DNA sequence: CGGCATACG
DNA sequence: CGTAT
DNA sequence: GCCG
């Protein structure tokens, strides 16, 4: 009933067991804060499968034979159902490991690695970082300053605000050039951390050099408070407000025509959605698949791919709206 | 037991 | 090391 | 932590 990869089931923005999932991905958060991949993943999984549910889990019986669910996800559903909450989860919440590698890594420029270095060496708070400013890099610096505006949720509101100015900078750089918008605001979410475009040509070749002239043209007009040939920037936007403004972080990539597709399914996500769909292509397909195109290793021959609907084809999946993708 | 996505800056 | 989905 |  319930297929073992995410890619293989539809997962919307809200579902009926929220605070079943938000649970499991505490416990995801702190495996990765410990170095846990793979204890990250199976609770990430866990998440997922509950997020694509029908209906609310009620009893622990509804649980058998869903896929990445065994002992100790089985427990954590056990006790939220029997008490309304589960002590390991809380355990974690209020524990200083938890919360402080929290809030060093949700630092622009700040790791795990990171940020465990400076929980070992006693570091706590975002002061105790602004007093030794001599061993942060400039992109630390940046995500430090900004860490206030960047803590503040982007709303769909200031993504149309944003889009147009990129489409303006675009415009000049490579006219016909576009702009898409991607991440989670192309899955559906109404709020998000940061802001995702993908720009392209429908000339192939035509978009080569294009990001250094788009970010000299948003620099030139005041918008850009940081930034880095390359095909990814990772930006922070001077974003005007009421009376004011606030830093935004967005995302800039660009990407060949030929290779859209391909760019706008990994930059659409989700994270867990994309790593899924990548693993069901290696381990049960054979084929390899990135943000790039999708590798036959038999025949040493890239699929050409014209849509996402292509892609899912390829690959024997069921289409999955972006909006189901939220895995 | 091995594997756990796959890139770019 | 950081970043991205 | 879980699947195969
Ligand atoms: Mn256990
Ligand atoms: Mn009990
Ligand atoms: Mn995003
Ligand atoms: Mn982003
Ligand atoms: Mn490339
Ligand atoms: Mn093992
Ligand atoms: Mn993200
Ligand atoms: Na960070």
């Given at each position: 009933?319930?297929?073992?990869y995410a890619c293989?089931?539809?997962?919307?923005?809200?579902?009926?067991?929220?605070?079943?999932?938000?649970?499991?991905?505490?416990?995801?958060?702190?495996?990765?804060?410990?170095?846990?991949?793979?204890?990250?993943?199976?609770?990430?999984?866990?998440?997922?499968?509950?997020?694509?549910?029908?209906?609310?889990?009620?009893?622990?019986?509804?649980?058998?034979?869903?896929?990445?669910?065994?002992?100790?996800?089985?427990?954590?559903?056990?006790?939220?159902?029997?008490?309304?909450?589960?002590?390991?989860?809380?355990?974690?919440?209020?524990?200083?490991?938890?919360?402080?590698?929290?809030?060093?890594?949700?630092?622009?420029?700040?790791?795990?690695?990171?940020?465990?270095?400076?929980?070992?060496?006693?570091?706590?708070?975002?002061?105790?970082?602004?007093?030794?400013?001599?061993?942060?890099?400039?992109?630390?610096?940046?995500?430090?300053?900004?860490?206030?505006?960047?803590?503040?949720?982007?709303?769909?509101?200031?993504?149309?605000?944003?889009?147009?100015?990129?489409?303006?900078?675009?415009?000049?750089?490579?006219?016909?050039?576009?702009?898409?918008?991607t991440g989670?605001?192309?899955?559906?979410?109404?709020?998000?951390?940061?802001?995702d475009?993908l720009?392209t040509?429908?000339?192939?070749?035509?978009e080569?050099?294009?990001?250094?002239?788009?970010?000299?043209?948003?620099?030139?007009?005041?918008?850009?408070?940081?930034?880095?040939?390359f095909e990814r920037?990772?930006?922070?936007?001077?974003?005007?407000?009421?009376?004011?403004?606030?830093?935004?972080?967005?995302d800039?990539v660009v990407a060949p025509v030929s290779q859209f597709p391909f760019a706008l399914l990994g930059w659409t996500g989700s994270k867990l959605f994309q790593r899924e769909l990548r693993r069901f292509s290696r381990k049960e397909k054979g084929l390899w698949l990135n943000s790039h195109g999708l590798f036959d290793p038999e025949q040493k021959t890239f699929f050409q791919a014209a849509s996402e609907?292509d892609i899912f084809?390829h690959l024997?999946l069921?289409?999955?709206?972006?909006?189901?993708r939220?895995a």
């Amino acid at each position: 009933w319930m297929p073992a990869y995410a890619c293989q089931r539809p997962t919307p923005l809200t579902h009926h067991n929220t605070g079943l999932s938000e649970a499991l991905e505490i416990l995801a958060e702190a495996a990765g804060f410990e170095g846990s991949e793979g204890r990250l993943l199976t609770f990430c999984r866990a998440a997922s499968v509950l997020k694509a549910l029908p209906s609310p889990v009620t009893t622990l019986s509804q649980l058998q034979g869903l896929p990445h669910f065994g002992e100790h996800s089985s427990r954590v559903v056990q006790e939220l159902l029997e008490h309304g909450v589960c002590e390991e989860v809380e355990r974690v919440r209020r524990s200083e490991r938890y919360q402080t590698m929290k809030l060093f890594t949700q630092i622009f420029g700040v790791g795990v690695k990171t940020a465990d270095r400076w929980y070992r060496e006693g570091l706590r708070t975002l002061d105790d970082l602004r007093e030794q400013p001599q061993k942060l890099t400039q992109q630390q610096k940046a995500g430090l300053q900004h860490h206030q505006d960047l803590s503040t949720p982007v709303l769909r509101s200031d993504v149309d605000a944003l889009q147009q100015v990129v489409e303006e900078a675009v415009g000049q750089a490579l006219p016909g050039a576009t702009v898409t918008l991607t991440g989670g605001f192309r899955r559906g979410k109404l709020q998000g951390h940061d802001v995702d475009f993908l720009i392209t040509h429908p000339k192939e070749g035509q978009e080569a050099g294009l990001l250094p002239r788009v970010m000299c043209r948003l620099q030139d007009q005041g918008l850009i408070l940081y930034h880095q040939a390359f095909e990814r920037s990772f930006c922070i936007f001077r974003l005007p407000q009421p009376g004011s403004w606030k830093a935004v972080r967005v995302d800039l990539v660009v990407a060949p025509v030929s290779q859209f597709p391909f760019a706008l399914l990994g930059w659409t996500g989700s994270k867990l959605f994309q790593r899924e769909l990548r693993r069901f292509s290696r381990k049960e397909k054979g084929l390899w698949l990135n943000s790039h195109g999708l590798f036959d290793p038999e025949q040493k021959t890239f699929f050409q791919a014209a849509s996402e609907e292509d892609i899912f084809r390829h690959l024997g999946l069921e289409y999955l709206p972006p909006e189901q993708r939220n895995a």
